[PDB]
Amino acid sequence: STHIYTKEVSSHTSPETGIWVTLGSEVFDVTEFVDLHPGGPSKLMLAAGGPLEPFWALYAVHNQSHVRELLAQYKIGEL
Ligand code: HEM
Protein backbone atom coordinates (compact mmCIF):
# COMPACT_ATOMS: atom_id res chain seq x y z
CA SER A 1 0.00 0.00 0.00
CA THR A 2 1.05 3.60 -0.48
CA HIS A 3 0.14 6.90 1.09
CA ILE A 4 -0.58 9.18 -1.88
CA TYR A 5 -0.33 12.98 -1.82
CA THR A 6 -1.05 15.52 -4.49
CA LYS A 7 1.56 18.04 -5.63
CA GLU A 8 -0.76 20.73 -4.37
CA VAL A 9 3.02 18.89 -0.84
CA SER A 10 3.30 22.57 -1.92
CA SER A 11 1.66 23.74 1.33
CA HIS A 12 4.39 22.13 3.47
CA THR A 13 7.03 24.77 3.62
CA SER A 14 7.43 25.48 7.38
CA PRO A 15 7.84 23.65 10.75
CA GLU A 16 4.25 24.39 11.72
CA THR A 17 3.07 22.52 8.68
CA GLY A 18 6.13 20.25 8.23
CA ILE A 19 8.72 20.87 5.53
CA TRP A 20 8.26 18.44 2.63
CA VAL A 21 10.09 17.78 -0.62
CA THR A 22 9.82 15.34 -3.48
CA LEU A 23 12.30 13.26 -5.43
CA GLY A 24 10.95 11.22 -8.30
CA SER A 25 7.41 10.31 -7.24
CA GLU A 26 8.39 9.99 -3.57
CA VAL A 27 7.37 12.48 -0.83
CA PHE A 28 9.60 13.19 2.20
CA ASP A 29 8.91 15.08 5.45
CA VAL A 30 12.40 16.43 6.15
CA THR A 31 11.46 18.81 9.02
CA GLU A 32 13.73 17.15 11.55
CA PHE A 33 16.74 17.09 9.22
CA VAL A 34 16.84 20.66 7.95
CA ASP A 35 18.93 22.32 10.69
CA LEU A 36 21.59 19.56 10.14
CA HIS A 37 21.91 20.23 6.43
CA PRO A 38 25.57 20.86 5.54
CA GLY A 39 26.08 24.74 5.24
CA GLY A 40 22.85 25.30 6.94
CA PRO A 41 19.21 24.98 6.32
CA SER A 42 18.54 28.04 4.21
CA LYS A 43 19.92 26.46 0.99
CA LEU A 44 17.81 23.34 1.53
CA MET A 45 14.76 25.50 2.10
CA LEU A 46 14.92 26.80 -1.50
CA ALA A 47 13.33 23.48 -2.45
CA ALA A 48 10.67 23.34 0.28
CA GLY A 49 7.27 22.25 -0.93
CA GLY A 50 8.51 20.92 -4.25
CA PRO A 51 10.88 18.72 -6.19
CA LEU A 52 14.59 18.43 -5.40
CA GLU A 53 15.57 17.69 -8.99
CA PRO A 54 15.92 21.27 -10.32
CA PHE A 55 18.25 22.13 -7.37
CA TRP A 56 20.14 18.86 -6.92
CA ALA A 57 21.07 18.99 -10.60
CA LEU A 58 23.58 21.74 -9.71
CA TYR A 59 24.94 19.93 -6.65
CA ALA A 60 26.38 16.55 -7.54
CA VAL A 61 27.53 16.05 -3.93
CA HIS A 62 23.98 14.66 -3.48
CA ASN A 63 24.76 11.88 -5.95
CA GLN A 64 26.05 9.46 -3.32
CA SER A 65 24.38 6.33 -1.96
CA HIS A 66 24.53 7.62 1.62
CA VAL A 67 22.64 10.81 0.71
CA ARG A 68 19.88 8.88 -1.02
CA GLU A 69 19.39 6.47 1.87
CA LEU A 70 19.50 9.36 4.36
CA LEU A 71 16.66 11.01 2.50
CA ALA A 72 14.76 7.71 2.42
CA GLN A 73 14.51 7.78 6.21
CA TYR A 74 12.12 10.72 5.84
CA LYS A 75 9.78 9.17 3.23
CA ILE A 76 6.07 9.60 3.99
CA GLY A 77 4.47 8.51 0.71
CA GLU A 78 4.22 9.13 -2.98
CA LEU A 79 2.68 11.39 -5.61
C1 HEM B 1 15.86 17.45 1.75
C2 HEM B 1 16.80 17.95 0.99
C3 HEM B 1 18.26 17.80 1.08
C4 HEM B 1 18.99 16.83 1.65
C5 HEM B 1 18.53 15.56 2.30
C6 HEM B 1 20.38 17.15 1.46
C7 HEM B 1 21.41 16.47 2.03
C8 HEM B 1 22.73 16.85 1.92
C9 HEM B 1 23.83 16.09 2.51
C10 HEM B 1 23.68 14.81 3.29
C11 HEM B 1 24.96 16.73 2.18
C12 HEM B 1 26.40 16.34 2.49
C13 HEM B 1 26.94 15.29 1.53
C14 HEM B 1 28.34 14.86 1.74
O15 HEM B 1 29.15 15.81 1.88
O16 HEM B 1 28.70 13.72 1.64
C17 HEM B 1 24.57 17.95 1.44
C18 HEM B 1 25.40 18.94 1.03
C19 HEM B 1 25.06 20.08 0.35
N20 HEM B 1 23.76 20.40 -0.05
FE21 HEM B 1 22.15 19.36 0.33
N22 HEM B 1 20.48 18.37 0.72
C23 HEM B 1 19.18 18.72 0.51
C24 HEM B 1 18.83 19.83 -0.26
C25 HEM B 1 19.68 20.74 -0.83
C26 HEM B 1 19.32 21.83 -1.73
C27 HEM B 1 17.94 22.08 -2.14
C28 HEM B 1 20.47 22.47 -2.05
C29 HEM B 1 20.66 23.61 -2.99
C30 HEM B 1 19.84 24.57 -3.28
C31 HEM B 1 21.55 21.79 -1.38
C32 HEM B 1 22.87 22.18 -1.41
C33 HEM B 1 23.90 21.59 -0.74
C34 HEM B 1 25.23 22.07 -0.72
C35 HEM B 1 25.71 23.40 -1.28
C36 HEM B 1 25.99 21.12 -0.01
C37 HEM B 1 27.45 21.16 0.24
C38 HEM B 1 27.80 21.80 1.55
C39 HEM B 1 29.27 21.83 1.88
O40 HEM B 1 30.00 20.80 1.82
O41 HEM B 1 29.60 22.94 2.15
N42 HEM B 1 21.06 20.74 -0.68
N43 HEM B 1 23.22 17.99 1.31
Check: CB of residue 27 under 8 Å from CB of residue 77.
Answer: yes
Give dist(CA 61, CA 17) in Å, integer: 28
Resolution in A: 1.2
Residues in the annotated binding site for heme b: 37, 62, 64, 66
Q: How far is the CA of 8 from the centre of ligand 1 (A)?
A: 24
3-class SS letters over the chain: CCCECCCCCCCCEECCCEEEEEECCEEEECCCCHHHCCCCHHHHHCCCCCECHHHHCCCHHHCCHHHHHHHHCCEEEEC
57 Cα–ligand 1 center, Å: 11
What type of residue is 30? V
Cα(13)–Cα(63) distance, integer angstroms: 24
**Closest to 22 measured CA to CA, from 33, 34, 7:** 7
- Dihedral (CA of 30, 32, 37, 43) sign: positive
CATH number of 1-79: 3.10.120.10
Q: How was this structure determined?
A: X-ray
Task: Determine the distance separating the centroid of ligand 1 and the alpha carbon of 48, expressed in angstroms.
Answer: 13
